[PDB]
Design an enzyme around this catalytic site. Structure first.
Site, PDB file in Angstrom:
ATOM      1  N   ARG A   1      42.743 124.840  31.418  1.00 29.95           N
ATOM      2  CA  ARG A   1      41.656 124.513  30.507  1.00 29.95           C
ATOM      3  C   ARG A   1      42.059 123.324  29.639  1.00 29.95           C
ATOM      4  O   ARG A   1      43.145 123.306  29.055  1.00 29.95           O
ATOM      5  CB  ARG A   1      41.311 125.726  29.636  1.00 29.95           C
ATOM      6  CG  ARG A   1      39.879 125.735  29.117  1.00 29.95           C
ATOM      7  CD  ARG A   1      39.772 126.448  27.772  1.00 29.95           C
ATOM      8  NE  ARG A   1      39.530 125.526  26.660  1.00 29.95           N
ATOM      9  CZ  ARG A   1      39.549 125.875  25.373  1.00 29.95           C
ATOM     10  NH1 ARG A   1      39.799 127.134  25.020  1.00 29.95           N
ATOM     11  NH2 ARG A   1      39.321 124.964  24.435  1.00 29.95           N
TER      12      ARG A   1
ATOM     13  N   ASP B   1      36.208 120.927  29.560  1.00 29.05           N
ATOM     14  CA  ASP B   1      34.994 121.555  29.056  1.00 29.05           C
ATOM     15  C   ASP B   1      33.887 120.549  28.818  1.00 29.05           C
ATOM     16  O   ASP B   1      32.729 120.947  28.647  1.00 29.05           O
ATOM     17  CB  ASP B   1      35.289 122.321  27.768  1.00 29.05           C
ATOM     18  CG  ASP B   1      35.500 123.799  28.016  1.00 29.05           C
ATOM     19  OD1 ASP B   1      34.587 124.437  28.604  1.00 29.05           O
ATOM     20  OD2 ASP B   1      36.581 124.316  27.637  1.00 29.05           O
TER      21      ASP B   1
ATOM     22  N   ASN C   1      24.958 140.810  26.003  1.00 29.55           N
ATOM     23  CA  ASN C   1      24.959 142.188  25.515  1.00 29.55           C
ATOM     24  C   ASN C   1      23.836 142.533  24.549  1.00 29.55           C
ATOM     25  O   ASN C   1      23.552 143.720  24.384  1.00 29.55           O
ATOM     26  CB  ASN C   1      26.293 142.526  24.822  1.00 29.55           C
ATOM     27  CG  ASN C   1      27.492 142.406  25.753  1.00 29.55           C
ATOM     28  OD1 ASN C   1      27.557 143.067  26.800  1.00 29.55           O
ATOM     29  ND2 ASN C   1      28.446 141.552  25.380  1.00 29.55           N
TER      30      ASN C   1
HETATM   31  N1  LIG Z   1      27.577 144.247  22.600  1.00 28.49           N
HETATM   32  C1  LIG Z   1      27.457 143.175  21.815  1.00 28.49           C
HETATM   33  N2  LIG Z   1      26.279 142.994  21.167  1.00 28.49           N
HETATM   34  C2  LIG Z   1      26.133 141.920  20.389  1.00 28.49           C
HETATM   35  N3  LIG Z   1      27.008 140.947  20.139  1.00 28.49           N
HETATM   36  C3  LIG Z   1      28.157 141.150  20.787  1.00 28.49           C
HETATM   37  C4  LIG Z   1      28.461 142.208  21.627  1.00 28.49           C
HETATM   38  N4  LIG Z   1      29.749 142.077  22.129  1.00 28.49           N
HETATM   39  C5  LIG Z   1      30.182 140.969  21.583  1.00 28.49           C
HETATM   40  N5  LIG Z   1      29.276 140.373  20.735  1.00 28.49           N
HETATM   41  C6  LIG Z   1      29.372 139.105  20.019  1.00 28.49           C
HETATM   42  O1  LIG Z   1      30.217 138.246  20.730  1.00 28.49           O
HETATM   43  C7  LIG Z   1      30.570 137.193  19.816  1.00 28.49           C
HETATM   44  C8  LIG Z   1      31.694 136.408  20.401  1.00 28.49           C
HETATM   45  O2  LIG Z   1      31.451 136.368  21.825  1.00 28.49           O
HETATM   46  P1  LIG Z   1      32.474 135.725  22.825  1.00 28.49           P
HETATM   47  O3  LIG Z   1      31.710 135.162  23.975  1.00 28.49           O
HETATM   48  O4  LIG Z   1      33.572 136.734  23.205  1.00 28.49           O
HETATM   49  O5  LIG Z   1      33.140 134.549  21.969  1.00 28.49           O
HETATM   50  P2  LIG Z   1      34.549 133.959  22.327  1.00 28.49           P
HETATM   51  O6  LIG Z   1      35.267 134.927  23.332  1.00 28.49           O
HETATM   52  O7  LIG Z   1      35.347 133.866  21.067  1.00 28.49           O
HETATM   53  N6  LIG Z   1      34.442 132.392  22.962  1.00 28.49           N
HETATM   54  P3  LIG Z   1      32.970 131.563  22.718  1.00 28.49           P
HETATM   55  O8  LIG Z   1      32.096 131.628  23.937  1.00 28.49           O
HETATM   56  O9  LIG Z   1      33.329 130.051  22.429  1.00 28.49           O
HETATM   57  O10 LIG Z   1      32.180 132.131  21.469  1.00 28.49           O
HETATM   58  C9  LIG Z   1      30.856 137.925  18.511  1.00 28.49           C
HETATM   59  O11 LIG Z   1      30.463 137.148  17.383  1.00 28.49           O
HETATM   60  C10 LIG Z   1      29.946 139.169  18.610  1.00 28.49           C
HETATM   61  O12 LIG Z   1      28.885 138.919  17.711  1.00 28.49           O
END
Ligand SMILES: Nc1ncnc2c1ncn2[C@@H]1O[C@H](COP(=O)(O)OP(=O)(O)NP(=O)(O)O)[C@@H](O)[C@H]1O
Ligand SMILES: Nc1ncnc2c1ncn2[C@@H]1O[C@H](COP(=O)(O)OP(=O)(O)NP(=O)(O)O)[C@@H](O)[C@H]1O
Lengths: 395, 322
Positions: free
Chosen positions: B31, B74, B261
């Protein structure tokens, strides 16, 4: 018949129109410019004549005295008592003013209070109100705020995604401008269609030296492209409109630009001027582009794309579109700009009639289009005179 | 057959058998945050000291050799944007001399999920007009037409576009000079304002995490409720721009932690879109089925789990084991 004067006072200028109401006929118009500077000039035109004089004009107080003296000295008015009311353009009414307002002494203070929010404009606008009340004591005055039409925006349209306190404590939020213009053309559209505004989802594009787009649904503004100040939204003559906010801290670290220089970057060196390298004037940039200047052609294309992106946002927010309005110096006269903005919109039922567009007819949509596309000349002074009639002369 | 996916105070890894896809580290795909203008695609590594030349534009990520390898950028997916989509209306010299332009990010995610959508529908991706919503702690939208990214919501840096966990996204640029003049903000203070203090965090005053904000809104916190509405409005305004640009819409994709989700977020984003032929089916949305549009709907609406690691592996397989 009533004689209503519409006033617009700038840092160094004084624009005025005298209207015959309620028909709206133009009795006289003109401009005092370079106030307090050398080359101070006074231009005054009637339906039939023009007069122009370079002479010293010390301050706005002297500018108003010359205007009033000329109205009788040129035989326009038999006397200053024929003036039935004055409307004044005011740049920023904050959240206080949801409508034009009768001028008493603490609407003036309220306008002074908001000076912090339009530093280059609100103080002189209030000075105009003061001078005319001093020199026209018996004539009622109305303030018409460029922000008032947009005070129907809902919170999820005016809140910026900053910490809550930036709004709750410092007043930072979307306000929007050209309110008087968007209000005037959308009501004019409804009268030309013979339906009420409350029945239509309307997008209004005021394209001049400054440009803004406004979404009007149910007779009310529900979004508009300028924000905290008139710098933002779409690309303009010399204003950049919206850009990546992180560019600004980058430029301060990198070039050491002060706050005043950042604001000058965004308001005076960007837009058509900054991209084309040619001019801030649409006609000049288009002329250069047809002579093969590729930056100029790019400038015109980016101009149209930024407006298209904003229209697209507002159609989504309203759930569709019944009418699109073009106005302002560019929107009223550039068939080419309008064509580029309206291309490939079959997904909305929107297409132009080329013959009609080329002569800037009132309606320019194609025969089978579902969306009405109007070219309407904006007339902000007429809209101000109608606010004067409504609030100062309610009979 | 044995491909490792690297993402480097961290070091995340993943090893898959392809193609089924089933110091601190004491073919491989790496990455890389920023590929600037010279990398239009993944690149066999050899490239490394032009990668590090771009540290100027991604100082926190790009600089972070230790390990056939391929670098995945990216930004690379978004290098098909036309100038009307990436040139800001600043003085020309800011692009021509300092390289300020829109780049866009989440390119690997948008690329992966859009290709997955096309595969699930059994058509070429170039047959579709697609809007892709990567909604997580970082958030971005991407318009894919003719199989190419034609716009995307992050700009010069990942700070901008729509509202995110802690990032404001786009705001009236005139706010910044004003904040300097009236609160003496430093250039770095502006940055942490826009990057660390805003978004869901700043508006709600509760959390950067969607779920946390969600709980506080259902208990009556009004800043929390407003944060979730604004979040949705920013995404809707951006989708609307890209539909306009593409001349219509065939499919809308939701991915990332929020998009995959949160039925609530997806329902609020898709509200009142019948003029597009877009409507959701309550039952399918509730269990995040792969397709959640109503059966009368003309637009497909998909929920696809993004898989950047597996997309990276397919890139080294393509350019290192052809
Ligand atoms: N079941 C769920 N319902 C709602 N929000 C969720 C749920 N599971 C995770 N999240 C949200 O997922 C967010 C982060 O998602 P995620 O895609 O894992 O970000 P990341 O792994 O840090 N990388 P990025 O894609 O740059 O944001 C958090 O702020 C949560 O609000
Ligand atoms: N016939 C025309 N064709 C193309 N552009 C035109 C034409 N006439 C005027 N313009 C442009 O329209 C713009 C002038 O807009 P105008 O609405 O008159 O601005 P303004 O009166 O100074 N105040 P504002 O409208 O708020 O910017 C300039 O770019 C002119 O070049």
């Amino acid at each position: 018949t009533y004689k209503i004067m519409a006033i617009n006072a700038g840092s160094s200028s004084l624009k005025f129109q005298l209207l015959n109401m309620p028909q709206g006929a133009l009795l006289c118009q003109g401009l005092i410019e370079r106030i307090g500077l050398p080359e101070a000039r006074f231009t005054l035109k009637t339906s039939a004549q023009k007069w122009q004089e370079t002479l010293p004009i010390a301050d706005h107080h002297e500018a108003v005295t010359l205007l009033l003296e000329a109205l009788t000295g040129r035989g326009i008015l038999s006397s200053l008592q024929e003036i039935d009311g004055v409307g004044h353009r005011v740049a920023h009414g904050g959240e206080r003013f949801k409508d034009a307002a009768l001028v008493c002494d603490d609407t003036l203070r309220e306008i002074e209070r908001l000076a912090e929010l339009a530093p280059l404009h609100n103080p002189v606008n209030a000075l105009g109100i003061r001078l005319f009340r001093q020199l026209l004591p018996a004539v009622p005055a109305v303030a018409v705020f460029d922000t008032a039409f947009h005070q129907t925006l809902a919170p999820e349209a005016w809140l910026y995604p900053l910490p809550w306190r930036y709004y709750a404590e410092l007043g930072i939020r979307r306000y929007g401008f050209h309110g008087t213009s968007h209000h005037y053309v959308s009501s004019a559209l409804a009268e030309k269609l013979g339906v009420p505004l409350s029945a239509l989802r309307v997008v209004s594009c005021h394209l001049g030296n400054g440009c803004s787009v406004c979404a009007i649904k149910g007779g009310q503004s529900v979004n508009t492209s300028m924000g905290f100040t008139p710098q933002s939204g779409v690309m303009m003559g010399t204003r950049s409109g919206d850009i990546d906010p992180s560019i600004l801290p980058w430029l301060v670290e990198k070039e050491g630009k002060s706050a005043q220089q950042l604001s000058q970057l965004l308001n005076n060196e960007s837009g058509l001027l900054g991209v084309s390298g040619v001019s801030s004037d649409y006609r000049d940039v288009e002329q250069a582009a047809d002579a093969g200047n590729e930056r100029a052609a790019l400038a015109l294309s980016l101009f149209a794309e930024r407006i298209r992106a904003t229209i697209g946002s507002y159609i989504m927010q309203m759930g569709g579109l019944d009418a699109l309005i073009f106005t302002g110096g560019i929107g009223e006269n550039s068939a080419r700009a309008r064509a580029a903005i309206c291309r490939n919109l079959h997904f909305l039922g929107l297409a132009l009639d080329d013959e009609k567009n080329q002569r800037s007819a009132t309606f320019i949509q194609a025969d089978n289009a579902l969306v009405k596309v109007a070219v309407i000349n904006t007339n902000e002074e007429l809209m101000i005179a109608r606010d004067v009639m409504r609030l100062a002369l309610p009979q």
